[PDB]
């Protein structure tokens, strides 16, 4: 029998056409019917029927039953190659999903092939199928994501590897440069889109915490000129302005912030080989201004590592600075104002904090758009030009002054090396706005910082309230106590009499008593209400003990980074890496990217001695040398290789110690008589600071 | 004159209040605080700009101030840009219905300019939530 | 006989292989030997031998002897298609012309085909052959040009049509836009290069006048900063700096200025269809910065008409203005100077000439680089902004004031309407520099002028002294008298006693006596020395009677247009068209390019009435209307179509006359009650000025 | 000190005249008329810049003034640009022989920079007859 008149495939038919063909040693009917039904897209709509009309278990059973030789596996790839252009153009033009919701049923049939991971699919079948999937409507994508969220973790990892292998093969099999790009490649774009679908499925498959959302921040008022212009146009205040959000994000209704612990770690979705071949300078433009064919990869930030996301944020900030400079030039030309294209911040070395606070307050309350200008800090009492060296100096001293325990601004826990907000900082709000604005300007100006905060601070900054699970990083002792209380299986009304009337110590030493509920002293903690006690105690500690201070800090931070794509690109677990830097000192990477000028060559007599000396440097001496030269003791975001160190020849063998131009990480090294003299001079030079 | 609902917003509606016609009305700019000539007041009437009141006083905008501050707003509050077809798909509302103004002269785009943008595949711009494009008068060399 | 062992072709062999084949009705040997010898490039080097080793007459004889049927003509095109890539790569790589000068001998053989003009060559043969010709060395091009210069005029016209037909076919057979260009097309570039070769052959084939060359102008001294910089670099003064000249021009040694009357008029070489498809905005860039494949057409200015050469000059001037604005912005930013990006020219309405003269003198003697800034004329006593309307106003009034016969600056001849330099303008040099600078700034700022000068003035401005042949335009009566004297066949020592002692009248009326030679009163004019008398009298009149005034005028004109490509693009016969404008008033062209704003539509009730009224306008009323609206009574360079007139609706039917915004050629037309009222208002409005 | 032939031109040659070494010589700029520090005088020695004399006085240039006026000259007296191979064909002299300086820092290009220009196909620039290119230090991001 040839089975020439079959239009739909069910479990028993695809099972009864097996024994007969095996006994008659004729596998031709199997392959011919497979190539007939599968290549015809409409056939899969009804084949293997019963918000899903497809029995996934039956699909798995038939797939493991048919994938048993070297001939049946070849009957699927050709059918896929024939089907994919047809389904692609059908979804593009005929709008098939509009007329029926069961057209999507073929996608799960196709994607349940456990051999999709095999290398033979990466040539022509998988790229076309991913193009067809990327050409799918939004509601179908949402329902497919909802279906995928029910899968087990290893299945989700399997899909993630299935798409990442295709991405790696497509970026390896071709070369890209400034001439030919990766954005215009259709197959890689489709693969990234399906990877985004899988990543959002993973995000929505885990726990979702939407109730503990921080209150929406107040958008800063623009300058009076823009308000007058909006009044003239009659638009006035319209609620159509907001952050750029993924259409899939608003269709699903669940943000990536809600997902606390996903099934698969977020770092797995990051694709390594794509980043080294991806250029941010064009990707940001393709993201801002839409292009007919090119697809920017910043629309899917998960696929980017911390090195390139920083590049995109820096490009956005630089473009904003350039626009501000253009506006200042236009003002000076037309209106006739003095050209002031810099955020002049003149402060005294002894009172940096107060002068910076008052200047920033008078700028913010008058010109909220002035903060977007390029920073230019000129210390009072000294004459010079800040090309990038004094700003980091001011940042370092302002960090030291603000984070001083003497002011009592932040409590210090030596067991963790993590400052925490001090609830007792009463009548002191300007300094919290000052430190928030300092962090914002640091992100804006690409200057790293030595700031130690628990992850709960960054989670609250992003817009998610702190909870019990975040207490471990902040208060490990309290977290241990409350988890021991939760894990007690006995009666808590018999051993301890701890109630909602909770008392805590103070900085001076005198404890104070706090009430969680209306009358905590009268209601003791029992077994049934124990769960609703810890989630309130931790909530109080992380939210309303610092309700006033952290509100001002968040407002100050958001005043600068309101228009930046920082809220869109970075998760709370990457903000600390963006602001601070890596603590690993790898001078081997610094060896490769170091540049020479002034006559020094790579294979010079003194360069090798200097490199030997610095390699033989002590763990702390490396930090001292880095702080002396580049103005900071921390590696930049990424590694030391990104720090384009430059060594410049100064002059003959003298008794003058080497000097460093901090603005460009430039070290001025004279040619000394020998290696030991150079080592002595370097030791004497890096220790003064 | 302290209740905004009573106070008019459009130029001819405001003219009807003062028992004067648009032919010989007297108006002064809001930024430079200088009197508008006939050309700019007629252009203000044509461009459909709402009258702004400061301390209960009528005010309009002159061509120089308008074209300067619109350029400033474009340079400052530029959000992103989109194609005409993509904008149509996003809003699902016909292009002739959405209110689109020129980037420079702030004049609403007639359907001819929107069609020209569609055929020439020029890019619509978003300025602080205000969709905008290039008019015919401002795109002439 | 098949003639299987022939390596070179001579006149008798190509003649003896004809009668035998005709009698035996077998033309196969002819076509096969033609395809053998011609396709092999090395064969033509020795075939048909004797700074030319090829008997051109024999080539003509054999070509007219063989071009007699429909089969032999097809034996050349295939051989050309096979040969051309080989010769092209041979000249490109092997440098064959270096090893021998007789390799060029094949080019004349190929180009002597009188059927090259036929349409069948434009498909594949002629483009490849022109590519091979364009890939030829410079010395070979020079010697080929020297050989071609001996041809008769109709032959040169034949070559010119041969290349122009190819150019027209190549521009017609393909479409070009901003996406796909014409510069990158290799065939059209090669055709233009061979057309340039033919054009220079025509130029050098006519009369060459190199002795009557004007003295080299003194290059203006740059600002002191550039002099100090050159001193620091040690380069100091370098004579290498000069105008961009054609390598073929310096190889031939004869400039296009020397050619007075070419064999073919220069306007014939102008290609019409290419200009409407050629974009200057990219051609100028390809001319300035070299591109790997694109070839700018401004390197061959003859192929461009006056409309597009003006576009190139305007683009160059605009780029210079932009660079000056950038420099001013940089000054204001770094040094801290007041931003002054305009050439502020504040003058009084009554004394424009003197105020402009003193301001321009104080600018030139202090900041020679200030003249390159954009002009901005603000009349004293009136407040406003000159967006392009006051500058043309100032130009018109300065022209009227300077060219007033009251000052005696220029003599007026009513029989020709052409002002001439007044030799009696003693102790008045500043005004001539003023008018020269006015003309230079007019060319720079794209503002036409009402200036009437003879062609000899522009010839002297370009750098060629006036001669006897140029006297007709300046002094027709004197030219007639001297040509009658020259054409007298009798003895001039018997009828008149005119000697070198020549007297002329003065403006007051009292004549003065001038001596041409040492003692002109003692040597009379004879028959043998009659020729060397007119060429000295006219030389004196056109050169040394105005030696002082015209030197200052030329210096003033060159002070502004020293760096412009005006000396490179425009011949002296086009300078007057660039400065002045066309006198033909064609409102039909203005109909098509007129634009409407303010609510007016093309098919409006009042627009048609206005168009009827202006079409029914008198010859002088059209000039009055144009002067009222656009500030000038002359059509721009090209036609009225290039004048982008704009009509803007003002308001309701009022009694106020229409007003014109001269900066943008904008006419403000209110909607009147009927057509007759609009006509009356227009008549009353255009007559005030 | 009024005869240019007697007066030296190079920094070490000038140093030999005053019986002082380059280690602790004192020099002042020509534009801003301010004393050069050690870094800029050593850079002046390295860049092979000829000493300019004003009224019989030694003078050098500081980094700010040099990099500002070189930029001004580039913006003002830019003539055209050419490729390395085309420049070689024009001059017929090897690239390592022609004196090519940086546009910004006015430092002569070592053969490494010229080779990098050749491979990367960067364009040499002509500034008032002074051929120039981009050095290694001024082309680092
Ligand atoms: Zn105004
Ligand atoms: Zn407009
Ligand atoms: Zn200086
Ligand atoms: Zn440099």
Q: Provide the residue ranges of all domains of chain D, joining segments of one domain with +.
A: 11-67, 77-136
Q: Per the structure block, which two tokens stand in for D21? A: 């070494």
Cross-chain Cβ contact A341/C333 below 8 Å: yes
Contacts of C333 in chain A (CB under 8 A): 339, 341
Q: Which bound ligand lies closest to the C-alpha atom of B43?
A: 2
Nearest alpha-carbon partner for B132 in B98, B94, B107, B101:
B101
A75 three-state secondary structure = helix
Q: Does the distance separating the beta carbons of D69 and C288 come in below 8 Å?
A: no
b/e code C417-447 from CB counts within 10 Å (16+ = b)? ebbbbbbebeeebebbbbbbbbbbbbbbbbb
Query: How far apart (Å, rounded) are the C-alpha atoms in residues A290 and A287?
Result: 7
Q: Find all residues with CB under 8 Å of D7, minimum gap 6, and list them.
A: D1, D53, D56
Q: Which ligand is nearest to the CA of D29?
A: 3
Helix runs in A446-490, H state only: 455-462, 471-474, 476-486
DSSP A665: T
What 3-state class would DSSP assign to A403? coil
**Helix-, strand-, coil-residue percentages of chain C, each rounded to 5:** 55, 5, 40
Ligand nearest to the CA of D60: 3
Determination technique for this PDB entry? cryo-EM
Query: What is the 3-state composition of chain A as percent helix, strand, coil, each rounded to the nearest 5?
Result: 55, 5, 40
Q: Exposed (0-12), middle (13-18) or buried (19+): which is A355, by Cβ within 10 Å?
A: middle
Residues in chain B within 8 Å Cβ distance of C651: 22-23, 38, 42
Distances (CA, A) of C351 to A18, C348, C354, C596: 108, 5, 6, 38
CA of D81 to the centre of ligand 4 (A): 17
Dihedral sign, Cα of residue C302, residue C308, residue C310, residue C316: negative
Q: Which helix (H) or strand (E) holds D72?
A: helix D63-76
User: How many angstroms separate the alpha carbon of residue B134 from the centre of ligand 2?
Assistant: 6
d(CA A249, CA A200): 8
Strand duo D78-82 + A659-661: pairing: unpaired
State the DSSP string of C284-313: HHHHHB--SS---GGGSGGGS-HHHHHHHH
d(CA C293, CA C586) in angstroms, rounded, equals 41
Burial C73-87 (b: 16+ CB within 10 A, else e): eebbbbbbebbbeeb
Min Cα–Cα distance to chain A from C339, Å: 7
Q: Give the full edge-to-edge strand order of the sheet including A659-661.
A: A595-597, A646-649, A666-669, A659-661
Distance CA(A214)–CA(A555), nearest Å, equals: 12
Chain A segment 288-347 residues within 8 A of C by beta carbon are 329, 332-333, 339, 341
- Which three-class secondary structure state does DSSP give residue C660? strand
Residue A250 class from Cβ within 10 Å (0-12 exposed, 13-18 middle, 19+ buried)? exposed
Ordered DSSP codes for C326-361: HHHHHHHHHT------EEEE---SS-HHHHHHHHHH
H and E: helices and strands count for chain A: 31, 10
Q: Å from A283 to nearest chain B CA? A: 14
The domain defined by D77-136 carries CATH number 3.30.240.40: yes
The C-alpha atoms of residue C163 and residue C111 are separated, in whole angstroms, by 11
Q: What share of chain B is helix, strand, coil (3-state, %, to 5)?
A: 40, 15, 45
User: CB-hemisphere CA count at 13 Å for C303?
Assistant: 26
Lookup: tokens for C257: 């200025």
Start-to-end CA span in chain B (Å): 45
Within chain A, what is the greatest distance between any pair of CA atoms?
A: 99
Cβ neighbours around A361 below 10 Å, total = 14
- The token pair at A599 is 């006559």
Question: What CA–CA distance (Å, rounded) separates C69 from C67?
Answer: 6
Query: CB distance D80–C228 less than 8 Å?
Result: no
Q: A332–C341: do the CB atoms touch at under 8 Å?
A: no
Residue C219's closest CA among C565, C541, C563, C539?
A: C563
β-strands A659-661, A666-669: how paired? antiparallel
Q: List CB contacts (< 8 A) between C288 and chain D.
A: 80-81
- Mark yes or no for CB contact B83/A369 under 8 Å: no
Interface of C with D (CB under 8 A): 222, 225-226, 228-235, 238, 240-241, 244, 287-290, 292, 323-324, 326-327, 330, 334-335, 369
Distance from CA of A243 to the nearest CA of B (A): 10
Q: How many Cα atoms within 13 Å fall on the side-chain side of residue C152?
A: 2
Record: contact C599-B140, CB cut-off 8 A: no
Reference A116, options A84, A148, A78, A77; nearest CA is A77
Q: Using the 8-state DSSP alphabet, how is residue C261 labeled?
A: S
Closest chain C residue to D107, measured at CA: C233
Closest chain C residue to A340, measured at CA: C333
Q: Which residue bears the tokens 């030291």?
A: A400
A193/chain B closest Cα distance in angstroms: 18
Give the single-character DSSP code of B126.
Answer: E
Alpha helix positions (H), B5-124: 11-17, 38-47, 63-76, 84-91, 111-120
Residue D45 CA to ligand 4 center (angstroms) comes to 15
Q: What is the DSSP letter of C416?
A: T
Do chains D and B touch, with touching meaning 3 or more CB–CB pairs less than 8 Å apart?
A: no
- Cβ count within 10 A of residue C539: 18
3-state secondary structure of A660: strand
Cβ neighbours, 10 Å, residue A444: 26
Q: What would the two tokens of residue C573 be? A: 């016969």
The position carrying tokens 């920083």 is: A310
Closest CB from D23, D38, D46 relative to A599: D46
Instruction: List beta partners, residue D133.
Output: D102
Task: Tell me which residue of A207, A51, A55 sits closest to A139, measured CA to CA.
Answer: A51
Fold of D11-67: CRO Repressor (3.30.240)
CB-CB under 8 Å, A595 with D39: no
Half-sphere exposure (Cβ direction) of A81: Cα atoms closer than 13 Å: 11
Phi and psi for A270 in degrees, rounded to 5? -65, 130
Neighbouring C-beta atoms of residue A429, cutoff 10 Å: 16
Rounded CA gap, C545 and A98, in Å?
91
The 3-state DSSP class for residue B132 equals strand
CATH code of the domain made up of B76-139: 3.30.240.40
Secondary structure (3-state) at C521: coil
Which residues of chain C neighbour B46 with C-beta distances below 8 Å? 598-599, 649
> Same CATH fold, B76-139 and B11-67?
yes
Q: State which H helix or E strand residue C199 sits in.
A: helix C186-205
Which residues of D fall within a CB distance of 8 Å from C330?
Answer: 68, 71-72, 75
- Which chains have at least 3 CB atom pairs separated by less than 8 Å from chain B? A, C
Q: Which residues surround ligand 2, an ion (CB under 5 A)?
A: B 102, 104-105, 135, 138
CA distance C51 to C54: 9
Task: Report the SS3 class of residue A256.
Answer: coil
Instruction: Check if the beta carbon of residue C629 is closer than 8 Å to that of residue C667.
Output: yes
Mark A121-140 as b/e (b = at least 16 C-beta within 10 Å): bbeebbbbbbbbbbbbeeeb
What are the tokens at C498?
Answer: 């005119």
Distance CA B106, CA B74 (A): 11
Interface of A with C in 32-51 (CB under 8 A): none
Residue A367 burial (CB count, 10 A): 13
E strand intervals along A607-680: 646-649, 659-661, 666-669
- DSSP 3-state of D100: coil
Which CATH number is C587-686 given? Answer: 3.30.2410.10
- What span, in angstroms and rounded, lies between the C-alpha atoms of A348 and D18? 43
The H-or-E segment that residue C146 falls in is: helix C138-148
Burial, A588: exposed, middle or buried (Cβ in 10 Å; 0-12, 13-18, 19+)?
exposed
Report whether C377 contacts C345 (CB < 8 A): yes
Q: Taking a C-beta distance cutoff of 8 angstroms, is the pair A261, A215 a contact?
A: no
Distance CA C325, CA A371 (A): 28
**A neighbours by CB contacts (3+ pairs under 8 Å):** B, C, D
Chain A residue with minimal CA distance to D64?
Answer: A385
Q: Which two tokens stand for residue A477?
A: 């002792």
Q: In what order do the strands lie in the sheet with B78-82?
A: B78-82, B124-127, B130-133, B101-102
The domain ranges of chain C are 1-119, 403-580, 587-686
Contact C290 D69 (CB under 8 A): no
CA-wise closest residue to A472 among A457, A456, A484? A456
Q: How many beta-carbon pairs under 8 angstroms link A with C?
A: 9
| Cβ atoms of A574 and A306 closer than 8 Å | yes
Q: In angstroms, rounded to a whole number, what is the distance separating the alpha carbons of residues C563 and C559?
A: 9
Note the maximum CA span of chain B.
Answer: 48
d(CA A62, CA C324): 77
Q: What homologous superfamily is domain A403-580 in, according to CATH? A: Hect, E3 ligase catalytic domains (3.90.1750.10)
């Amino acid at each position: 029998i040839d089975f020439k008149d079959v239009t739909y495939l069910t479990e028993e038919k695809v099972y009864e056409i097996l024994e007969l063909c095996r006994e008659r040693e004729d596998y031709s009917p199997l392959i011919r019917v497979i190539g007939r039904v599968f290549s015809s897209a409409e056939a899969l709509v009804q084949s293997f029927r019963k918000d899903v009309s497809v029995d996934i278990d039956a699909i798995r059973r038939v797939y493991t039953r048919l994938l048993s030789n070297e001939k049946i596996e070849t009957a699927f790839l050709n059918a896929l190659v024939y089907l994919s252009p047809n389904v692609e153009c059908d979804l593009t033009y005929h709008n098939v999903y509009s007329r029926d919701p069961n057209y999507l049923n073929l996608f799960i049939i196709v994607m349940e092939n456990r051999n999709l991971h095999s290398p033979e699919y990466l040539e022509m079948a998988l790229p076309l199928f991913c193009k067809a999937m990327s050409k799918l409507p939004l509601a179908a994508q949402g329902k497919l994501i909802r279906l995928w969220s029910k899968y087990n973790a290893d299945q989700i990892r399997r899909m993630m590897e299935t798409f990442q292998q295709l991405i790696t093969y497509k970026v390896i099999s071709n070369e890209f440069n400034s001439r030919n790009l990766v954005n215009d490649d259709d197959a890689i774009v489709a693969a990234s889109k399906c990877l985004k679908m899988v990543y959002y499925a993973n995000v929505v498959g885990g726990e979702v915490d939407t109730n503990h959302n921080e209150e929406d921040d107040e958008e800063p008022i623009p300058e009076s000129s823009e308000l007058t212009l909006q009044e003239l146009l009659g638009e006035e205040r319209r609620n159509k302005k907001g952050p750029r959000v993924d259409p899939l994000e608003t269709e699903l209704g669940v943000k990536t912030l809600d997902c606390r612990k996903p099934l698969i770690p977020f770092e797995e979705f990051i694709n390594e080989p794509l980043n080294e071949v991806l250029e941010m300078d064009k990707d940001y433009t393709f993201f801002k201004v839409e292009t007919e064919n090119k697809f920017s990869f910043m629309t899917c930030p998960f696929i980017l590592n911390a090195v390139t996301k920083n590049l995109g944020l820096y490009y956005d900030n630089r473009i904003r600075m350039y626009s501000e400079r253009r506006i200042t030039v236009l003002y000076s030309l037309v209106q006739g104002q003095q050209l002031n294209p810099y955020l002049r911040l003149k402060v005294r070395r002894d009172h940096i904090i107060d002068d910076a606070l008052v200047r920033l307050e008078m700028i913010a309350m008058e010109n909220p758009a002035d903060l977007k200008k390029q920073l230019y800090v000129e210390f009072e009492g000294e004459q010079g030009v800040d090309e990038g060296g004094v700003s980091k100096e001011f940042f370092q001293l302002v960090v030291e002054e603000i984070f001083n325990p003497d002011i009592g601004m932040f409590t210090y826990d030596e067991s963790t090396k993590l400052f925490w907000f001090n609830p007792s900082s009463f009548e002191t709000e300007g300094q919290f706005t000052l430190i928030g604005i300092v962090l914002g300007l640091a992100i804006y100006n690409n200057c790293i910082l030595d700031v130690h905060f628990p992850m709960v601070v960054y989670r609250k900054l992003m817009g998610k309230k702190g909870t019990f699970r975040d207490l471990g990083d902040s208060h490990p002792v309290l977290y241990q106590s409350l988890k021991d209380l939760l894990e007690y299986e006995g009666n808590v009304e018999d051993d301890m009499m701890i109630t909602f009337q909770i008392s805590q110590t103070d900085l001076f030493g005198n404890p104070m008593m706090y009430d969680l509920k209306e009358n905590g002293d009268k209601i003791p903690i029992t077994n049934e209400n124990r769960k609703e006690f810890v989630n309130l105690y931790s909530d109080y500690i992380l939210n309303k003990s610092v309700e006033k201070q952290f509100k001002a800090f968040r407002r100050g931070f958001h005043m600068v980074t309101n228009e930046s794509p920082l809220k869109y690109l970075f998760r709370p677990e990457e903000i600390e890496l963006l602001i601070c830097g890596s603590r690993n000192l790898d001078f081997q990477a610094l060896e490769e990217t170091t540049e020479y000028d002034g006559g020094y060559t790579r294979d010079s007599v003194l360069i090798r001695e200097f490199w030997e000396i610095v390699h033989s440097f002590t763990d702390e001496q490396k930090r001292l040398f880095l702080q002396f030269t580049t103005g900071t003791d921390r590696a930049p975001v990424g590694g030391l290789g990104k720090l384009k160190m430059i060594i410049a020849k100064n002059g003959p063998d003298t008794e003058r110690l080497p000097t460093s131009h901090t603005a460009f990480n430039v070290l001025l090294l004279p040619e000394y008589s020998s290696k030991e003299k150079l080592k002595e001079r370097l030791l004497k030079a890096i220790t003064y600071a | 004159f302290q209740d905004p609902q009573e106070r008019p917003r459009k130029l001819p509606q405001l003219c009807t209040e003062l028992q004067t016609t648009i032919h010989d009305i007297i108006l002064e700019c809001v930024y430079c605080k200088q009197q508008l000539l006939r050309r700019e007041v007629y252009d203000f009437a044509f461009r459909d700009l709402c009258i702004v009141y400061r301390d209960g006083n009528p005010y309009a905008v002159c061509d120089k101030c308008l074209k300067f501050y619109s350029k400033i707003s474009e340079y400052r509050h530029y959000s992103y840009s989109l194609y005409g077809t993509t904008l149509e798909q996003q809003y699902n509302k016909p292009l002739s219905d959405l209110l689109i103004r020129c980037i420079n002269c702030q004049k609403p785009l007639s359907p001819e300019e929107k069609q020209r943008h569609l055929d020439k595949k020029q890019r619509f711009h978003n300025i602080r939530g205000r969709w905008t494009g290039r008019c015919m008068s401002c795109s002439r060399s």
